[PDB]
Design a binder for this molecule. Structure first.
Ligand SMILES: CCCCCCCC/C=C\CCCCCCCC(=O)OC[C@H](COP(=O)(O)OCCN)OC(=O)CCCCCCC/C=C\CCCCCCCC
Ligand SMILES: CCCCCCCC/C=C\CCCCCCCC(=O)OC[C@H](COP(=O)(O)OCCN)OC(=O)CCCCCCC/C=C\CCCCCCCC
Ligand code: HEM
Ligand code: HEM
Ligand code: HEM
Ligand code: HEM
Ligand code: HEM
Ligand code: HEM
Ligand SMILES: CCCCCCCCO[C@@H]1O[C@H](CO)[C@@H](O)[C@H](O)[C@H]1O
Ligand SMILES: CCCCCCCCO[C@@H]1O[C@H](CO)[C@@H](O)[C@H](O)[C@H]1O
Ligand code: FES
Lengths: 78, 241, 379, 147, 379, 241, 78
């Protein structure tokens, strides 16, 4: 598929300025950084969980394995 | 029991990402390799030639290869003969073949140290700990005839007897040859011997980091620049109603 | 014609694939991996070729030919490193590439997706047979254990492995055919990679919001060329940092010992990018089923397109399955872990559990949470 | 035509003449008298052939199979009583066991201490199984072919 | 769409290149060589790959790895033979392929013809670096003499050869890079071969009477597929007869002696398919000019399209130039001869004469007899 | 003078395109190789194992390898030791290395005969002529110390003295061992030794020729069949005028 | 270029028969062999010449070279 036969579009007016008449990385604070946060706090509660969960299991696992090696002070009290 | 003790972690003079090897120490190490290890441990991949320009002078190294004679190609009559080693010869092998060595070191086989530092977990930290670390076996544990207890070694029984005590050799640069100290240099050597690049590879790593630093922001600004025409764009719907 | 860039039989091919090519505007950064994957390939083939020019494929010269290449061949060390580490950059990317598609339903473009699975299989094989080449303990033992697996295949089994490699065991006659195979496959990857992009180009490129992009596309070049080159550097910098500061960070030391058939190392395990499956392999005891689990762990990808139920393509507006998705990656991540560990109690369990939670999330949860998710939208 | 060409090429892949040559091994039983354990090379690994005396034989046949980690009746593992044929590789980590040694008068692997009996059965050490017995048969009273 | 053979992104590629493809009806049997050339390639790449699986690229194992392949590898002998002899089938065809084009003015399709020249150059290189592999006396000496030629290139000369191969002389470090190069190039041939056919397909296929075929084309498959398969067997039978009865008919015996740097054979000469140029090479004494003559002996092909004057394309109805043409092949045939002979009197002359009659027939006669031939037709 | 004499051309029993090697003769040859040539000429690529099934019985060949002991791998102590050759060993080398041999045959070096037959123009025709063909040098021509005139050999001076006269050995199959005759078998051997395929390669050539014979006519008839629709076709121009 | 847009053709009527209603390799003598000859004798006089010529030169060359080796009975009549 090429250009000129994608869709039946009507009544949309767009306005844009040359790259040289504007700023590249504008308003890092006014709108920039906020949205970055507007995002970290939007998925953290959806992504983090299973990862955190994984972690606990990784730890439990390693710790347990590393315990089942050491001897029990009482396997021989005689 | 698959129970083991893991080496600590020493602040080697060459662990910094941007810190190279201390060649004065490398130089030393070479000496302990040559004067003590080289009688059991082969180092097939390094050769005198390498020392040149790194921790030894050309002539200096040339004379150091002479000290050893090597077996060389057929006669005019077709037989093996000896001769003073040149600069291009590789470090001498202590034994003609493995089984030959296994029989000189009571069964065990002293590994070639060319890549040892990277053939064992821990590298220098490991080797060091191992060298300066033999001691009497703990109670209940008994090592058999010919083996020597060393906690740092898996199984704690090494076919290798403590190879390094105070003196044993005398660093000519004028340095207090204490076991601990001597073992340090041997390790920094083993490092170099395993990856001669090291210093070169890092100076390079520096130069790469600075390029990434400079290159990405540029293309970032550039990417941001072309796009702006969209990021800033503004739609509007105007049906004639 | 005027343009003379849209008329020429060859340029027209380029000006229609890297310029003037209609790409959606809202393409996410996840789409930067196809690019990377491709350049990742150019890179391997290069460094490899240049590295093959110093290698000898023979039991008695392999290990040292490589060593020599590093100690003697100018900048040889760097080339080897890049190639080795590159293998990983390659898989990390191919894995993020799969991902993006799995969760933007890119896979609904069946043909372009099926070839992609063939790309993964191929890229694997070439990387398995390629690691033997250096002929170190793991190279050898890995080859001997992983190849011998086919042995489970009843009847026409033993005879396959026994022919696959040399004659009776991974020895010289197989290092050669492996070297050859390694040299050949990458070019087949590139070949197929063309077919991949062809099928792709048939339809547009999918996008994050999963709804028709026709509404407003943008010329690839002016934009995406820049976009990808940016990605190239942003991802290539860590590659090099890793490649130049911790060269062996991801490499088994045991593979610095020339292969020796009289010393089987403890803990024989394939490269990390294979672990997840190595895990699911030793999950089921019956050797046969084990292979099948292994085979299915990857081949399942062919089924994904038939397990899509959502009335929506991507899963941007599908919070439920969204956690299911991350719960899944986490799962693979765990399988990886379990694979690097010994076959002992704390693990053995976590293993077959995770392994089980793998096939369920793909086979049964996803599709189910799928429809259920539809009812909730009144559909 | 195709059937041929295809199969011909499908063999220039299979093991070659030089390999099949070391495929099978002929051993003279008469040159290995009772009491000693002989080592040979087969498929790049040591092949153990030992002639057993009353002491070695009987002491080995009496212990219970369900008491072993690798339950195996020596007489269900052998063709001829005076003959033991073993793969010279410990089942633990690929090492080589020693003749005339150990707590069981058979073989002992010094790598991690696996002890085997004169029947090649695992008794001491982590070794998961008894030494492997190669596929084979006899050619005569003094001849044996393994492979 | 209905056909479902003309709609599918891939089949459509095939059904448009081996079926439904408009081919002139009067196509001559000379057109059967493109086909052959292609299958000739599939064959090499196959036998080669399969042969590479038993080779070792190292001064100390090369010669015997090949020998072993023949004495030990099942049907190994046959595979080597086919591959070796195939090299020739390849050139005989590529030479008849050039021919047909030279005299049907097929070359007027510039782009499709220029790539073809690139195909020839490539196919050569791959065959020069490929003959060294067996590392026999000629393999070695041929490599040493022919490579050292660049030495004439002033200034940046010696340094090229001296880098080209290993370090100071054809030794191990070059056998490797040659082996690698040999393995790589064939795939590049196939790559380009695609571009070749692309450009071709742009226009129709030319035909013997050199006049528009549109008047009546015919579906390739129903017809030409059959036609070519016929050619395949008619030409493949001698290949095999030669390959199976006189295996060494075209092979220098001196190349059965493991390479030895202390014994330069007398009469060092490259394979027959190179001779014609080897001749034109030793025609001019000044070492430098010699290379140039050599280089120009092939590169001249790029100029052919600019030396066409006839108001007609083919030269079916051009009796004069028709004899010129045959007078030319005869000429190449002679150069071949002169090349296999020593550099002595009866020859040395016939050599530079034929060599001179080569560049004149292409550079000056042909174009001239061309226009003159036009006046005679009242044009 | 680059002046030379070229061998004639004998009707070998194996020159027919469809004619294989006469194994009874091959068998013989082996004997002359073994009992006379093998003391100077190496044949590194053939091994007893090959004789099996071609001109010798398995056991027959097994016993023939025993006759020779070979040097084999390191001890348990690491040293080279001898032992009776097996079926898998390759024919023994007369000398430890070239220079060693050049010194035993007055400078010259007896080539390995593995591929000789195809390493020289003429092959058997050559070798034969050479063997049964020494004679006194023609007038004006004088050969130096240690060399022997032979017209068939370039330079006419061979470091090889006539190696074959009547008897010298006794073919056990019961055959009149005349120089001429014995040299014939040695040649048919050299042939086999150089290309063991031979017989197989030809029986194969036969089968291929018959396929070409059958396959081409079929596809020819088939090609002719599809085309006919054109070859027979008939045009006609009918403008309404 | 595909089928259906090759050329502006008009007024040509062609007649052909199924392959099964006719003969494959027909009239080898009636018309077959003649034309083969109608051809050998049509180009022989155009192709043969330069080849024949080549031959003579090949022979001359080999013969001469093979003569310049042998000695002249008179390079020494003393
Ligand atoms: C198998 C080997 C597996 C191990 C490889 C390890 C790689 C480790 C994973 C690192 C993951 C980094 C993720 C950062 C994520 C940031 C984010 O949480 O938000 C998610 C996000 C944004 O949400 P939207 O709804 O589109 O936003 C609206 C548009 N503005 O998009 C993310 O999809 C795409 C994530 C791809 C995940 C990467 C996972 C790769 C592994 C899975 C492959 C699985 C397939 C099956 C078998 C493999 C063979
Ligand atoms: C360089 C290496 C050169 C040596 C390779 C050796 C191959 C030996 C040549 C054998 C030639 C067989 C020719 C049989 C010819 C039969 C014939 O005389 O008639 C000619 C004929 C028919 O005439 P029409 O007018 O079309 O008929 C009207 C339509 N019905 O058609 C023949 O063209 C096409 C002939 C192709 C000639 C083959 C020559 C191959 C060599 C030349 C390549 C030269 C290019 C320059 C450099 C090479 C790099
Ligand atoms: C010289 C100071 C010296 C060094 C350095 C050294 C190192 C070394 C290492 C790291 C090992 C490998 C440990 C491992 O397997 O993980 C090792 C092993 C052996 N060595 Fe050693 N060694 C040094 C010196 C010597 C000397 C002087 C001898 C011989 C008298 C010697 C011998 C051995 C042997 C034997 C082993 C045992 C290996 C085993 O598996 O038991 N070493 N050495
Ligand atoms: C045994 C009957 C026998 C054969 C057969 C044989 C052959 C042979 C050939 C074909 C050559 C090569 C000729 C060439 O270079 O073109 C050759 C050369 C030498 N031989 Fe020989 N030879 C046979 C036997 C023997 C024996 C018994 C000896 C050693 C006592 C011997 C030695 C040599 C030597 C020396 C050469 C000379 C090579 C040179 O360049 O002068 N041969 N032989
Ligand atoms: C080495 C092989 C591969 C390369 C070089 C490759 C390359 C590409 C390229 C160039 C793109 C375009 C940009 C993009 O959308 O990311 C692409 C798209 C795609 N690839 Fe791959 N790919 C590879 C492997 C795979 C794999 C394994 C899969 C399948 C599991 C796959 C699935 C897809 C799909 C579905 C698209 C994306 C469509 C979209 O969402 O817009 N690719 N690939
Ligand atoms: C598809 C891209 C490729 C992948 C995924 C790949 C992967 C690998 C791997 C895993 C290694 C092992 C590195 C190590 O020793 O740690 C390797 C080695 C090697 N590869 Fe590749 N390879 C690829 C392409 C190539 C190609 C096409 C060539 C050259 C024609 C090549 C030639 C080699 C050689 C010679 C080695 C041995 C040297 C060495 O391992 O250092 N590789 N490759
Ligand atoms: C290995 C490389 C080559 C292959 C496989 C190849 C293949 C082909 C194919 C498939 C055809 C179509 C059938 C035909 O017209 O003969 C073709 C056409 C052509 N090739 Fe090649 N070709 C090769 C080399 C060359 C060379 C060296 C030249 C240039 C000097 C060349 C010039 C042409 C041209 C002009 C056409 C024919 C157009 C016509 O007369 O109808 N090709 N080639
Ligand atoms: C373009 C097609 C090819 C041509 C023109 C070609 C030509 C040759 C030549 C001239 C030889 C020498 C035969 C001899 O020793 O007398 C040769 C050898 C060899 N070629 Fe190729 N070759 C081609 C492709 C291949 C490929 C792609 C492979 C495998 C990947 C290959 C692998 C080899 C090997 C291993 C040898 C050495 C074994 C031998 O010479 O018998 N060849 N090739
Ligand atoms: C993509 C960013 C690439 C960064 C450029 C790589 C720089 C490599 O630079 C290298 O530095 C070494 C140390 O001085 C020199 O010895 C080498 O000759 C030089 O090539
Ligand atoms: C294109 C025509 C191909 C002809 C078929 C090739 C026939 C090869 O046939 C071969 O004949 C040998 C001799 O009996 C057998 O030993 C081989 O096993 C067999 O494959
Ligand atoms: S490897 Fe066998 S007991 Fe240790």
């Amino acid at each position: 598929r090429q250009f000129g036969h994608l869709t039946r579009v009507r009544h949309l007016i767009t306005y844009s300025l040359s790259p040289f008449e504007q700023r590249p990385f504008p308003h890092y604070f006014s709108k920039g950084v906020p949205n970055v946060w507007r995002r970290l706090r939007a998925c953290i509660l959806r992504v983090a969980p299973p990862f955190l969960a994984f972690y606990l299991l990784y730890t439990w696992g390693t710790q347990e394995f590393e315990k089942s090696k050491r001897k029990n002070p009482a396997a021989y009290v005689n | 029991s698959d129970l083991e003790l893991h080496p600590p972690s020493y602040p080697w003079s060459h662990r910094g990402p941007l810190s190279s090897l201390d060649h004065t120490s490398i130089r030393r190490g070479f000496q302990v390799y040559k004067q003590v290890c080289s009688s059991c441990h082969s180092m097939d991949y390094v050769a005198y030639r390498h020392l040149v320009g790194v921790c030894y002078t050309e002539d200096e190294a040339k004379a150091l290869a002479e000290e050893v004679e090597v077996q060389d190609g057929p006669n005019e009559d077709g037989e093996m003969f000896m001769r003073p080693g040149k600069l291009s010869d590789y470090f001498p092998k202590p034994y003609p073949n493995p089984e030959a060595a296994r029989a000189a070191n009571n069964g065990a086989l002293p590994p070639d140290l060319s890549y040892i530092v990277r053939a064992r977990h821990g590298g220098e930290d490991y080797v060091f700990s191992l060298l300066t670390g033999y001691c009497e076996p703990p109670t209940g544990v008994s090592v058999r005839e010919g083996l020597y207890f060393n906690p740092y070694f898996p199984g704690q029984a090494i076919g290798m007897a403590p190879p390094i005590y105070n003196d044993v050799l005398e660093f000519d640069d004028g340095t207090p040859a204490t076991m601990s100290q001597v073992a340090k240099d041997v390790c920094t050597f083993l490092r170099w011997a395993a990856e001669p690049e090291h210093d070169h590879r890092k100076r390079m790593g520096l130069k790469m980091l600075l390029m990434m630093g400079l290159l990405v922001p540029l293309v970032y600004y550039m990417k941001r620049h072309k796009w702006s025409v969209l990021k800033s764009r503004k739609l509007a719907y105007r049906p004639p109603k | 014609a005027p343009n003379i860039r849209k008329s020429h039989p060859l340029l027209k091919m380029i000006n229609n694939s890297l310029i003037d090519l209609p790409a959606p505007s809202n393409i996410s950064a996840w789409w930067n991996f196809g690019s990377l994957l491709a350049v990742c390939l150019m890179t391997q083939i290069l460094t490899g070729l240049l590295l093959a020019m110093h290698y000898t494929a023979d039991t008695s010269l392999a290990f040292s030919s490589v060593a020599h290449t590093c100690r003697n061949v100018q900048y040889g060390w760097l080339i080897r490193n890049l190639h080795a580490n590159g293998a990983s950059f390659f898989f990390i990317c191919i894995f993020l590439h799969i991902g993006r598609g799995l969760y933007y339903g890119s896979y609904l473009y069946k043909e372009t997706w099926n070839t992609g699975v063939i790309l993964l299989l191929t890229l694997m094989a070439t990387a398995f047979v390629g690691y033997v080449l250096p002929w170190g303990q793991m190279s050898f033992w890995g080859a001997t254990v992983i190849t011998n697996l086919f042995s489970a295949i009843p009847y026409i089994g033993h005879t396959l492995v026994e022919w696959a490699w040399g004659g009776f065991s991974v020895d010289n006659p197989t290092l050669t055919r492996f070297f050859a195979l390694h040299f050949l496959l990458p070019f087949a990857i590139a070949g197929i990679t063309i077919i991949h992009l062809t099928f792709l180009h048939e339809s547009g490129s999918n996008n994050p919001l999963g709804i028709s992009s026709d509404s407003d596309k943008i010329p690839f070049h002016p934009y995406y060329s820049f976009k990808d080159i940016l990605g190239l550097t942003l991802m290539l910098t860590p590659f090099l940092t890793l490649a130049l500061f911790s060269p062996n960070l991801l490499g088994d030391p045991e593979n610095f010992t020339p292969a020796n058939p009289l010393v089987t190392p403890p803990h024989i395990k394939p490269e990390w990018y294979f672990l997840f499956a190595y895990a699911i392999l030793r999950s089921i005891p019956n050797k046969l089923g084990g292979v099948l689990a292994l085979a299915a762990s990857v081949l399942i990808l062919f089924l994904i397109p038939f397990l899509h139920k959502s009335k929506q393509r991507t899963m941007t507006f599908r919070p439920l399955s969204q956690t299911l998705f991350w719960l899944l990656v986490a799962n693979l991540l765990i399988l990886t872990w379990i694979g690097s560990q010994p076959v002992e109690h704390p693990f053995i369990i976590i293993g077959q559990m995770a392994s089980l939670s793998y096939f369920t999330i793909l086979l049964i949860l996803f599709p189910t949470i799928g429809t259920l998710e539809n009812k909730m939208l009144n559909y | 035509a195709a059937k041929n060409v295809v199969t011909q090429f499908v063999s220039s892949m299979s093991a070659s003449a030089d390999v099949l040559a070391m495929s099978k091994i002929e051993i003279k039983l008469s040159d290995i008298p009772e009491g000693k354990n002989m080592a040979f090379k087969w498929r790049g690994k040591p092949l153990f052939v030992r002639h057993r005396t009353k002491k070695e034989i009987d002491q080995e046949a009496a212990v219970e199979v369900s008491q072993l980690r690798d339950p195996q009746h020596d007489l269900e593992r052998v063709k001829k009583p005076e003959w033991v044929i073993l793969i010279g590789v410990c089942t633990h980590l690929g090492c080589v066991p020693i003749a005339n040694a150990g707590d069981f008068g058979g073989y002992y692997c010094p790598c991690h201490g696996s002890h085997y009996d004169a029947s090649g059965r695992i008794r001491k050490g982590p070794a998961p199984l008894n030494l492997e017995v190669p596929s084979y048969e006899f050619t005569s009273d003094d001849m044996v072919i393994v492979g």
